[PDB]
Design a protein around this ligand. Structure first.
Ligand code: STI
Length: 297
């Protein structure tokens, strides 16, 4: 959680142990695509077990991507390697960096992206219930606490960047190059960038600073998305001059109908204008642990 240092991924070395024979990959359907990159479902052979086919996700540069994007993908690969493999973050499995297009291989998450999952399961609210939502809030906070412990900042925390897999385990991801931010209305032009403004802390919007605390703000917005079962934040409030003024003034979202009081309390603290008053992910983990225990029986 040291806001005075950061991990420069170009200084991270690429561990050759990750290198995987690209001829042992069989590419499938597109899971996401941006301008210079895409994620596809694929099959990997002898990736973990010698004579076993396993489904994976593969992030690749399109032929139309430049060195800048290859560097970014390599940096992302090194960051994932640095983070290591954890229950609540997407797991790196390998890479193909030579002899073809640069590819990064991770686990495949059988329930796909959490935002789509919530939207699909909105009616079922097997069925989705409160404890599922609490579990997702807990696991995302847990994963983010780990990221912060590694002195890493997400910068785009949102339901769309969470995946869901076996046993309803969430995995923090970052589509990065592989999201079409040009045609995603959740990304708004601000200056010479398309930014996830509705998820962003005021200090990020106005001063372009991202911190452990701005990730916590985004987590608050995520909680809102979660307990609204995938609704877009600030309903009936398009990102314009009024929006910026209102956020600066102190306008905040009301509680989702399905949020327990303490979960909304967390949201409100995450959206404190003062970053120093926001909870840490470590704190949030404890709070949600308690709520989950209380919400059982
Ligand atoms: C194939 C791949 C390659 C790279 C990544 N990388 C990440 O998921 C990731 C997560 C966190 C960080 C940490 N990082 C720290 C610094 N900041 C600024 C950015 C975030 C970096 C990369 C994921 C994947 N996996 C991936 N990506 C998108 C979708 C899917 C997917 C979709 C549907 C079903 N199963 C899997 N799977």
């Amino acid at each position: 959680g040291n806001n005075y240092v950061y991990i420069d991924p170009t200084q991270l070395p690429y561990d050759h142990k990750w290198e995987f024979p690209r001829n042992r990959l069989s590419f499938g359907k597109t899971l996401g695509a941006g301008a210079f990159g895409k994620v596809v479902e694929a099959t990997a052979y002898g990736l973990i077990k010698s004579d076993a086919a396993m489904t994976v996700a593969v992030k690749m540069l399109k032929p139309s991507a430049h060195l800048t994007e290859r560097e970014a993908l390599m940096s992302e690969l090194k960051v994932l390697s640095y983070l290591g493999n954890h229950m609540n973050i997407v797991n790196l499995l390998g890479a193909c960096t030579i002899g073809g297009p640069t590819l990064v291989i991770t686990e495949y998450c059988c329930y796909g992206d959490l935002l789509n999952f919530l939207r699909r399961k909105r009616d079922s609210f097997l069925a989705l219930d409160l404890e599922d939502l609490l579990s997702f809030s807990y696991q995302v906070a847990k994963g983010m606490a780990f990221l912060a412990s590694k002195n890493c900042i997400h910068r785009d925390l949102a339901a769309r960047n969470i995946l869901l897999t076996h046993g309803r385990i969430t995995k923090i991801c970052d589509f990065g190059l592989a999201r079409d931010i040009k045609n995603d209305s959740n990304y708004v032009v601000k200056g010479n960038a398309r930014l996830p403004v509705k998820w962003m802390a005021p200090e990020s919007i106005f001063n372009c600073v991202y911190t452990f605390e701005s990730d916590v703000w985004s987590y608050g917005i995520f909680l809102w998305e979660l307990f609204s079962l995938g609704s877009s934040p600030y309903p009936g409030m398009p990102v314009d001059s009024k929006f910026y003024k209102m956020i600066k003034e102190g306008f905040r979202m009301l509680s989702p109908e399905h949020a327990p009081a303490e979960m909304y309390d967390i949201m409100k603290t995450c959206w404190d204008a003062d970053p120093l008053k926001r909870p840490t992910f470590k704190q949030i983990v404890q709070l949600i642990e308690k709520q989950i225990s209380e919400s059982t029986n």
